[PDB]
Structure 1
Amino acid sequence: DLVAKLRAFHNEAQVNPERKNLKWIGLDLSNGKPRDNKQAGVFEPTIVKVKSLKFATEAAITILRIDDLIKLHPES
């Protein structure tokens, strides 16, 4: 329910030009309701998100390339 409400808020922000300020709405975990996190002071550096996205995508691609595993028995 919370994710559905958050998605509805963000979709309304993206589709309605005069409701663009709704894109700051995040999750308020203490009360379990959507909250404007920009006004609430919940901030993160942009570099964290960008680097996380890039690194996770590259790791996922690296694992996804594998389709065959050969596991040699140890020489010991």
Structure 2
Amino acid sequence: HNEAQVNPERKNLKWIGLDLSNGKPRDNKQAGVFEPTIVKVKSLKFATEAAITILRIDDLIK
């Protein structure tokens, strides 16, 4: 994914997934492992919210 940014021509190298069978990097859009965008986006939102809420609850002494 570094080459997806430094190299402006290797744009279609971004979906290199994790091939759990052979344990090697693998183009994953061709492979077909897929996730709904809403799932990832909203999970990121909730992870951030949970981290923020726990991190706010700090100013205690015990």
Flag whether TM exceeds 0.5 (same fold): yes
Deviation at 1:68, TM superposition (A): 3.8
Of all paired residues, the percent bearing the same amino acid is 100
Deviation at 1:48, TM superposition (A): 0.5
Gaps of 5+ in 2: none
How far apart, CA to CA, are the structure 2 residues paired with 1:69 and 1:41? 49
Kindly indicate which of the two structures has a greater share of residues assigned to helix: 1
TM-score by length of 1: 0.75
How far apart, CA to CA, are the structure 2 residues paired with 1:16 and 1:70? 51
Q: In structure 2, what is the equivalent of residue 69 of structure 1?
A: 60
TM-score by length of 2: 0.90
Q: Give 3-state SS (helix, strand or coil) of 1:56's partner.
A: helix
Cα-to-partner distance string for 1:35-54 (whole Å, 9 max, x where unaligned):
00000011110001000000
Kindly indicate which of the two structures has a greater share of residues assigned to strand: 1
Deviation at 1:15, TM superposition (A): 1.2
How far apart, CA to CA, are the structure 1 residues paired with 2:39 and 2:61? 36
Deviation at 1:66, TM superposition (A): 1.0
Deviation at 1:69, TM superposition (A): 4.7
Q: How many residues align?
A: 62
RMSD: 1.6
Larger radius of gyration: 1
How far apart, CA to CA, are the structure 2 residues paired with 1:36 and 1:45? 18
